[PDB]
Amino acid sequence: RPSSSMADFRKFFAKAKHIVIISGAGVSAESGVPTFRGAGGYWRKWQAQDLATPLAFAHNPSRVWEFYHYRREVMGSKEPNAGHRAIAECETRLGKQGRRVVVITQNIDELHRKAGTKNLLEIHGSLFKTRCTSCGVVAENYKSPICPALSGKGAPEPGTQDASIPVEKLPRCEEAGCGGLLRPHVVWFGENLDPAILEEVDRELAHCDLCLVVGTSSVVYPAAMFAPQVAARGVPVAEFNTETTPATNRFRFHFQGPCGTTLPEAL
Ligand SMILES: [Zn+2]
């Protein structure tokens, strides 16, 4: 069934008054941005599903920041693409017209935010946000590097050497009289989700009259808990992906290829 109609699609898109846009790894990967919870591209000597766990920060905090210094870093040179932008501009327009567009995004790169998207829901946090592991405070952090110690430390290559920066040298909360060890405020495997962020997610799913999916779909994680709700209520689901045919899900629309291509036109 999954219609291939940018025709009718453009019909509902003109009709619908509260669009919710679930964003995917793909959207970020079309930029220049490094996926790791991905097929290949390990980061040095370890699995990245394996560095991004709470016990990693427990056994070597140093070499995890090592992993996220890099992350934070690499994106100095990466930009929002035509997808990030189509979506942004579409938000603005109908914004003053008189309609809500929302963007739900598992990604942590903040590329949507650079593109000018105001309604963002990053359901894994940002790697430009820190959490003090002591007085769980949260904070925009953009400093390059994050800690003098980490300057030059983080090398992509393998057989790179460790770093083993004494905890005390790692990122430390500036909160007056705290100084606990800073971690990345980014949802880890085994880790759960901002329940607030979820009750808004779920909120914008009951009230949405148009739903979009881009990058990584309803068949593949992290993206699923959101596909099911839309279909039952009686609401159309356009899926925009780069995954040719391999799949386990279908709905009112599917399109193909980069969302650089498609989206600009669509929205
Ligand atoms: Zn603190």
Residue numbers in the entry: 35 to 301
What text does the study give?
Sirtuins are protein deacetylases and hydrolyze one NAD+ for each Lys residue they deacetylate, which links their activity to cellular energy levels. The conserved Sirtuin catalytic core comprises a Rossmann fold domain and a Zn2+-binding domain. The substrate polypeptide occupies a cleft between these domains, with the acetyl-Lys in a tunnel leading to the active site.
Data quality was impaired by significant twinning (twin fraction 47%), and the density for resveratrol further weakened by its low occupancy (∼50%), likely due to its low solubility. However, density not accounted for by the built Sirt5/FdL1 model indicated an activator molecule bound close to the peptide substrate, directly contacting the FdL fluorophore. In the Sirt5/FdL1-peptide/resveratrol structure, the asymmetric unit contains two Sirt5 monomers with the active centers facing each other. Due to limited space resulting from this orientation only one peptide binding cleft is occupied by FdL1-peptide. The acetyl-Lys points toward the catalytic His158, and the FdL1 N-terminus occupies the same peptide binding channel as observed in other Sirtuin/peptide complexes. The C-terminal FdL1 fluorophore is packed with one surface on top of a hydrophobic patch formed by Tyr255 and Pro256 in the β7/α11 loop, and its edge is approached by Arg71. The activator A-ring is bound between Thr278 and Thr279 in the β8/α13 loop on one side, and Gly72 and Ala73 in the α2/α3 loop on the other side. The resveratrol B-ring interacts in almost perpendicular orientation with the coumarin fluorophore and contacts a protein patch formed by Gln83 and the α2/α3 loop around Arg71 and Gly72. The structure indicates that binding of resveratrol between the α2/α3 and β8/α13 loops closes the active site opening, thereby trapping the bound peptide and increasing the interaction interface by directly contacting the FdL1 substrate fluorophore.
